Design a protein around this ligand. Structure first.
Ligand SMILES: [Mg+2]
Ligand code: NA
Ligand code: NA
Length: 278
């Protein structure tokens, strides 16, 4: 079921500028479309050079990301404008989100209040509600993959980015090669079990703990420790960080950081939880 993308030179149509993102398999650059002057983010994904290579991204994996992206139109999720390709790269022309990572914002700013945390979290929940309503599991939710529209307002607006691990969950679970960042992955990821929408809900619990405390709940000194911690549900609320945080906030996290995916809050549960619900 593979398709093909526009094979004119991206350079003919766009000018690139500042670098917005860089990872193992992709680089993201601001860009401007010549015909309109509108600005975008160009994500250059390196292709695989042979069938059996570990370097670059398989065409299947690229096309999955593109196909999911084409489905989406919501204020809290990145959208896709165009796709180009050449021998080396697939080039996704994505919506531009220019206010930086939530990761960097958190690093740079004072500790959040519950209101500040919930103003972020509610947007994340709304985006994930959209995705999950479409049976799209993101599988890579973390502060690095939440981008701020404008970092210089009291209550920054966000979009979820980076659909490189996202999958359609049309049979309730998927059982494929899916493994994100140890600090954020759910126990079923760690244990290589079938995965569904529920994994993203665990990640949201981790994000929430971080938003409220500045600390990562499962993080060990090595990746293997972090993974062991996740699987064991080895976290606690430290008084030094949480003494002035409401018990209802803690309840919200506690009901997301649950090993059995069936018992974990769903996205609808999270929206109705008393900490969130009006
Ligand atoms: Mg990305
Ligand atoms: Na345009
Ligand atoms: Na939109």
């Amino acid at each position: 079921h593979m398709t093909v993308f526009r094979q004119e030179n991206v350079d003919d149509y766009y000018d690139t500028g500042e670098e917005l993102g860089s990872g193992q398999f992709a680089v993201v650059k601001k860009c401007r479309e010549k015909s309109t002057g509108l600005q975008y983010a160009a994500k250059f994904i390196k292709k695989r050079r042979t069938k059996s290579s570990r370097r670059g991204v398989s065409r299947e994996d690229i096309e999955r990301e593109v196909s999911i992206l084409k489905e989406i139109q919501h204020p809290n999720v990145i959208t896709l404008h165009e796709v180009y390709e050449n021998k080396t790269d697939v080039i996704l022309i994505l919506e531009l989100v220019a206010g930086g990572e939530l990761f960097d914002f958190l690093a740079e700013k004072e500790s959040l209040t519950e209101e500040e945390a919930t103003e972020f979290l509610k947007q994340i929940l709304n985006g994930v509600y959209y995705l999950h309503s479409l049976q799209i599991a993101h599988f890579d939710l973390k502060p690095e993959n939440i981008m701020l529209l404008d970092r210089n307002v009291p209550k920054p607006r966000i979009k979820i980015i980076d659909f490189g691990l996202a999958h359609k969950i049309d049979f309730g679970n998927e059982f494929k090669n899916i493994f994100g960042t140890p600090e954020f992955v759910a126990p079923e990821i760690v244990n290589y079990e079938p995965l569904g929408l529920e994994a993203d809900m665990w990640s949201i619990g981790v994000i929430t703990y971080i938003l409220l405390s500045g600390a990562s709940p499962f993080l060990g000194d090595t990746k293997q420790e972090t993974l062991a911690n996740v699987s064991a549900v080895n976290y606690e609320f430290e008084d030094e960080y949480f003494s002035n945080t409401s018990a209802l906030a803690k309840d919200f996290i506690r009901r997301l950081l649950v090993k059995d995916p069936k018992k974990r809050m769903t996205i609808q549960d999270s929206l109705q939880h008393p900490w969130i619900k009006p």
